[PDB]
Design a protein around this ligand. Sequence first.
Ligand SMILES: CCCCCCCCCCCCCCCCCC(=O)OC[C@H](COP(=O)([O-])OCC(O)COP(=O)([O-])OC[C@@H](COC(=O)CCCCCCCCCCCCCCCCC)OC(=O)CCCCCCCCCCCCCCCCC)OC(=O)CCCCCCCCCCCCCCCCC
Ligand SMILES: CCCCCCCCCCCCCCCCCC(=O)OC[C@H](COP(=O)([O-])OCC[N+](C)(C)C)OC(=O)CCCCCCCCCCCCCCCCC
Lengths: 77, 57
Amino acid sequence: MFLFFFCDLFWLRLLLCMYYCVWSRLCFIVYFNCLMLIFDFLLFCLFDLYLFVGLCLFLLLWFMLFNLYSLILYYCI
Amino acid sequence: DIMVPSFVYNKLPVIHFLQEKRAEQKLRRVLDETYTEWTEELDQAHVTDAITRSLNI
Ligand SMILES: CCCCCCCCCCCCCCCCCC(=O)OC[C@H](COP(=O)([O-])OCC(O)COP(=O)([O-])OC[C@@H](COC(=O)CCCCCCCCCCCCCCCCC)OC(=O)CCCCCCCCCCCCCCCCC)OC(=O)CCCCCCCCCCCCCCCCC
Ligand SMILES: CCCCCCCCCCCCCCCCCC(=O)OC[C@H](COP(=O)([O-])OCC[N+](C)(C)C)OC(=O)CCCCCCCCCCCCCCCCC
Protein backbone atom coordinates (compact mmCIF):
# COMPACT_ATOMS: atom_id res chain seq x y z
CA MET A 1 0.00 0.00 0.00
CA PHE A 2 1.37 3.37 -1.13
CA LEU A 3 -0.60 6.51 -0.26
CA PHE A 4 0.29 9.74 -2.06
CA PHE A 5 -0.51 12.87 -0.07
CA PHE A 6 0.86 16.34 0.60
CA CYS A 7 1.68 18.42 3.65
CA ASP A 8 -0.35 21.49 4.61
CA LEU A 9 2.61 23.88 4.32
CA PHE A 10 2.52 24.79 0.62
CA TRP A 11 1.32 28.35 1.20
CA LEU A 12 3.85 28.72 4.01
CA ARG A 13 6.56 27.40 1.69
CA LEU A 14 5.50 30.05 -0.82
CA LEU A 15 5.73 32.74 1.86
CA LEU A 16 9.14 31.47 2.96
CA CYS A 17 10.41 31.70 -0.61
CA MET A 18 8.94 35.18 -1.04
CA TYR A 19 10.15 36.63 2.27
CA TYR A 20 13.55 34.89 2.56
CA CYS A 21 15.02 35.39 -0.89
CA VAL A 22 17.00 38.13 0.90
CA TRP A 23 18.90 37.79 4.15
CA SER A 24 17.50 38.76 7.54
CA ARG A 25 18.87 38.68 11.06
CA LEU A 26 17.45 36.24 13.61
CA CYS A 27 17.56 37.38 17.23
CA PHE A 28 14.73 35.41 18.88
CA ILE A 29 15.05 31.63 19.17
CA VAL A 30 12.59 29.35 20.94
CA TYR A 31 15.36 27.15 22.38
CA PHE A 32 18.39 29.40 22.80
CA ASN A 33 20.19 27.02 25.17
CA CYS A 34 21.46 24.88 22.29
CA LEU A 35 23.80 27.76 21.44
CA MET A 36 25.18 28.31 24.98
CA LEU A 37 26.13 25.03 26.64
CA ILE A 38 29.18 26.31 28.53
CA PHE A 39 28.73 29.10 31.07
CA ASP A 40 32.10 29.10 32.86
CA PHE A 41 34.93 30.48 30.76
CA LEU A 42 38.11 28.51 30.03
CA LEU A 43 36.02 25.32 29.79
CA PHE A 44 36.06 23.60 26.41
CA CYS A 45 34.83 20.30 24.99
CA LEU A 46 36.55 18.07 22.44
CA PHE A 47 33.19 16.52 21.53
CA ASP A 48 31.09 18.11 18.80
CA LEU A 49 28.70 19.70 21.27
CA TYR A 50 27.30 22.24 18.78
CA LEU A 51 26.21 19.59 16.26
CA PHE A 52 22.62 19.84 17.53
CA VAL A 53 22.14 23.53 16.66
CA GLY A 54 21.17 23.00 13.03
CA LEU A 55 18.75 20.16 13.72
CA CYS A 56 17.30 22.12 16.63
CA LEU A 57 16.66 25.18 14.48
CA PHE A 58 15.09 23.19 11.65
CA LEU A 59 12.92 21.17 14.03
CA LEU A 60 11.71 24.35 15.72
CA LEU A 61 10.84 25.91 12.36
CA TRP A 62 9.01 22.81 11.13
CA PHE A 63 7.06 22.19 14.33
CA MET A 64 6.19 25.89 14.56
CA LEU A 65 4.94 26.05 10.98
CA PHE A 66 2.64 23.15 11.87
CA ASN A 67 1.57 23.59 15.49
CA LEU A 68 1.22 27.37 15.79
CA TYR A 69 -0.73 27.73 12.54
CA SER A 70 -3.00 24.82 13.54
CA LEU A 71 -4.93 27.25 15.74
CA ILE A 72 -6.46 28.61 12.54
CA LEU A 73 -9.66 26.68 11.91
CA TYR A 74 -9.45 23.79 9.42
CA TYR A 75 -5.63 23.90 9.41
CA CYS A 76 -4.28 20.35 9.52
CA ILE A 77 -1.33 18.98 11.47
CA ASP B 1 18.68 29.61 1.97
CA ILE B 2 17.42 30.75 5.38
CA MET B 3 19.30 29.54 8.43
CA VAL B 4 22.99 30.00 7.60
CA PRO B 5 22.32 33.40 5.95
CA SER B 6 20.62 34.70 9.10
CA PHE B 7 23.48 33.63 11.35
CA VAL B 8 26.07 35.12 9.01
CA TYR B 9 24.08 38.35 9.15
CA ASN B 10 24.15 38.20 12.95
CA LYS B 11 27.94 37.78 12.88
CA LEU B 12 28.70 40.83 10.73
CA PRO B 13 28.52 43.60 13.37
CA VAL B 14 30.83 41.97 15.92
CA ILE B 15 33.40 40.91 13.32
CA HIS B 16 33.36 44.41 11.84
CA PHE B 17 33.87 45.90 15.30
CA LEU B 18 36.71 43.53 16.19
CA GLN B 19 38.53 44.06 12.90
CA GLU B 20 38.31 47.84 13.28
CA LYS B 21 39.94 47.51 16.70
CA ARG B 22 42.61 45.21 15.25
CA ALA B 23 43.39 47.78 12.56
CA GLU B 24 43.60 50.54 15.17
CA GLN B 25 45.88 48.27 17.20
CA LYS B 26 48.24 47.92 14.24
CA LEU B 27 48.35 51.69 13.71
CA ARG B 28 48.95 52.28 17.42
CA ARG B 29 51.87 49.84 17.44
CA VAL B 30 53.30 51.54 14.35
CA LEU B 31 53.28 54.90 16.12
CA ASP B 32 54.61 53.48 19.39
CA GLU B 33 57.76 52.11 17.72
CA THR B 34 58.81 55.56 16.45
CA TYR B 35 61.43 57.38 18.52
CA THR B 36 63.56 60.36 17.48
CA GLU B 37 67.17 59.18 17.23
CA TRP B 38 69.80 61.79 18.13
CA THR B 39 73.33 61.10 16.91
CA GLU B 40 76.57 62.22 18.57
CA GLU B 41 79.51 63.53 16.55
CA LEU B 42 83.12 64.11 17.57
CA ASP B 43 83.40 67.55 19.14
CA GLN B 44 85.47 69.92 17.03
CA ALA B 45 87.40 71.23 20.05
CA HIS B 46 89.43 68.01 20.20
CA VAL B 47 90.18 68.52 16.51
CA THR B 48 91.30 72.07 17.29
CA ASP B 49 93.50 70.74 20.11
CA ALA B 50 95.14 68.09 17.93
CA ILE B 51 95.71 70.80 15.32
CA THR B 52 97.50 72.92 17.93
CA ARG B 53 99.62 70.02 19.16
CA SER B 54 100.69 69.17 15.61
CA LEU B 55 102.02 72.73 15.32
CA ASN B 56 104.43 71.91 18.21
CA ILE B 57 102.93 74.78 20.24
C1 LIG C 1 -0.36 6.14 -12.18
C2 LIG C 1 -0.83 7.55 -11.90
C3 LIG C 1 0.30 8.54 -11.64
C4 LIG C 1 1.10 8.30 -10.37
C5 LIG C 1 2.26 7.34 -10.52
C6 LIG C 1 3.04 7.12 -9.24
C7 LIG C 1 4.07 6.00 -9.29
C8 LIG C 1 4.53 5.54 -7.92
C9 LIG C 1 5.53 4.41 -7.93
C10 LIG C 1 5.63 3.66 -6.61
C11 LIG C 1 6.07 4.52 -5.44
C12 LIG C 1 5.87 3.85 -4.08
C13 LIG C 1 6.22 4.73 -2.89
C14 LIG C 1 5.34 5.96 -2.74
C15 LIG C 1 5.50 6.68 -1.41
C16 LIG C 1 4.73 7.98 -1.32
C17 LIG C 1 4.94 8.70 0.00
C18 LIG C 1 4.39 10.10 0.02
O1 LIG C 1 3.68 10.57 -0.83
O2 LIG C 1 4.79 10.76 1.11
C19 LIG C 1 4.24 12.08 1.33
C20 LIG C 1 5.30 13.10 1.01
C21 LIG C 1 4.77 14.50 1.12
O3 LIG C 1 5.86 15.43 0.96
P1 LIG C 1 5.57 17.00 1.03
O4 LIG C 1 5.89 17.49 2.40
O5 LIG C 1 4.21 17.22 0.49
O6 LIG C 1 6.60 17.63 0.00
C22 LIG C 1 6.76 17.03 -1.31
C23 LIG C 1 6.23 17.98 -2.36
O7 LIG C 1 6.55 17.47 -3.65
C24 LIG C 1 6.77 19.38 -2.23
O8 LIG C 1 8.09 19.33 -1.65
P2 LIG C 1 9.17 20.43 -2.07
O9 LIG C 1 8.46 21.66 -2.48
O10 LIG C 1 10.20 20.52 -1.00
O11 LIG C 1 9.83 19.81 -3.37
C25 LIG C 1 10.88 20.53 -4.06
C26 LIG C 1 10.24 21.49 -5.03
C27 LIG C 1 10.62 22.92 -4.75
O12 LIG C 1 9.54 23.78 -5.20
C28 LIG C 1 9.31 23.81 -6.51
O13 LIG C 1 10.10 23.46 -7.34
C29 LIG C 1 7.94 24.35 -6.81
C30 LIG C 1 7.06 23.37 -7.57
C31 LIG C 1 6.57 22.22 -6.71
C32 LIG C 1 6.12 21.01 -7.50
C33 LIG C 1 5.88 19.78 -6.64
C34 LIG C 1 4.60 19.83 -5.84
C35 LIG C 1 3.42 19.14 -6.51
C36 LIG C 1 2.08 19.74 -6.14
C37 LIG C 1 0.88 18.95 -6.62
C38 LIG C 1 0.83 18.70 -8.12
C39 LIG C 1 0.99 19.95 -8.97
C40 LIG C 1 0.09 19.99 -10.20
C41 LIG C 1 0.14 18.74 -11.07
C42 LIG C 1 -0.85 18.76 -12.21
C43 LIG C 1 -1.30 17.38 -12.65
C44 LIG C 1 -2.36 17.39 -13.74
C45 LIG C 1 -2.92 16.01 -14.02
O14 LIG C 1 10.73 21.16 -6.37
C46 LIG C 1 10.15 20.15 -7.02
O15 LIG C 1 9.11 19.65 -6.67
C47 LIG C 1 10.95 19.73 -8.21
C48 LIG C 1 10.09 19.38 -9.41
C49 LIG C 1 9.61 20.60 -10.18
C50 LIG C 1 8.86 20.26 -11.46
C51 LIG C 1 8.65 21.45 -12.39
C52 LIG C 1 8.07 21.07 -13.74
C53 LIG C 1 8.00 22.21 -14.73
C54 LIG C 1 7.56 21.78 -16.12
C55 LIG C 1 7.45 22.91 -17.13
C56 LIG C 1 7.06 22.43 -18.52
C57 LIG C 1 6.90 23.54 -19.55
C58 LIG C 1 6.59 23.03 -20.94
C59 LIG C 1 6.39 24.13 -21.98
C60 LIG C 1 6.10 23.59 -23.37
C61 LIG C 1 5.84 24.67 -24.41
C62 LIG C 1 5.56 24.13 -25.80
C63 LIG C 1 5.24 25.21 -26.80
O16 LIG C 1 5.71 12.88 -0.38
C64 LIG C 1 7.03 12.91 -0.65
O17 LIG C 1 7.87 13.19 0.16
C65 LIG C 1 7.30 12.56 -2.08
C66 LIG C 1 6.78 11.18 -2.45
C67 LIG C 1 7.25 10.72 -3.82
C68 LIG C 1 7.66 9.26 -3.86
C69 LIG C 1 8.16 8.79 -5.22
C70 LIG C 1 7.05 8.51 -6.22
C71 LIG C 1 7.56 8.07 -7.58
C72 LIG C 1 7.56 9.17 -8.62
C73 LIG C 1 6.20 9.40 -9.28
C74 LIG C 1 6.25 10.40 -10.43
C75 LIG C 1 5.04 10.36 -11.34
C76 LIG C 1 5.22 11.17 -12.62
C77 LIG C 1 4.14 10.95 -13.67
C78 LIG C 1 2.82 11.64 -13.37
C79 LIG C 1 2.07 12.07 -14.62
C80 LIG C 1 0.69 12.66 -14.38
C81 LIG C 1 -0.33 11.61 -14.01
C1 LIG D 1 3.45 35.84 18.27
C2 LIG D 1 2.00 35.76 18.67
C3 LIG D 1 1.05 35.94 17.50
C4 LIG D 1 -0.39 36.20 17.92
C5 LIG D 1 -1.29 36.65 16.78
C6 LIG D 1 -2.70 37.00 17.23
C7 LIG D 1 -3.67 37.25 16.09
C8 LIG D 1 -5.00 37.82 16.55
C9 LIG D 1 -6.14 37.59 15.57
C10 LIG D 1 -7.44 38.26 15.97
C11 LIG D 1 -8.67 37.70 15.29
C12 LIG D 1 -8.50 37.48 13.80
C13 LIG D 1 -9.79 37.10 13.08
C14 LIG D 1 -9.58 36.68 11.65
C15 LIG D 1 -10.86 36.34 10.91
C16 LIG D 1 -10.64 35.71 9.55
C17 LIG D 1 -11.93 35.39 8.82
C18 LIG D 1 -12.74 34.31 9.48
O1 LIG D 1 -13.90 34.10 9.26
O2 LIG D 1 -12.02 33.61 10.35
C19 LIG D 1 -12.74 32.91 11.38
C20 LIG D 1 -11.83 31.89 12.00
C21 LIG D 1 -12.61 30.81 12.69
O3 LIG D 1 -13.69 31.41 13.44
P1 LIG D 1 -14.97 30.53 13.80
O4 LIG D 1 -14.53 29.25 14.41
O5 LIG D 1 -15.91 31.40 14.53
O6 LIG D 1 -15.60 30.24 12.37
C22 LIG D 1 -17.02 30.00 12.25
C23 LIG D 1 -17.17 29.22 10.97
N1 LIG D 1 -18.10 28.04 11.01
C24 LIG D 1 -19.36 28.40 11.73
C25 LIG D 1 -18.44 27.60 9.62
C26 LIG D 1 -17.44 26.90 11.73
O7 LIG D 1 -11.01 32.56 13.00
C27 LIG D 1 -9.86 31.96 13.35
O8 LIG D 1 -9.66 30.78 13.25
C28 LIG D 1 -8.86 32.96 13.85
C29 LIG D 1 -7.94 32.39 14.92
C30 LIG D 1 -6.61 33.10 15.00
C31 LIG D 1 -5.70 32.57 16.09
C32 LIG D 1 -4.29 33.11 16.04
C33 LIG D 1 -3.39 32.40 15.05
C34 LIG D 1 -1.92 32.77 15.18
C35 LIG D 1 -0.98 31.88 14.40
C36 LIG D 1 -0.93 32.16 12.91
C37 LIG D 1 -0.11 33.38 12.55
C38 LIG D 1 -0.01 33.63 11.06
C39 LIG D 1 1.03 34.67 10.68
C40 LIG D 1 1.56 34.52 9.26
C41 LIG D 1 2.51 35.63 8.86
C42 LIG D 1 3.44 35.27 7.72
C43 LIG D 1 4.49 34.23 8.07
C44 LIG D 1 5.62 34.16 7.07
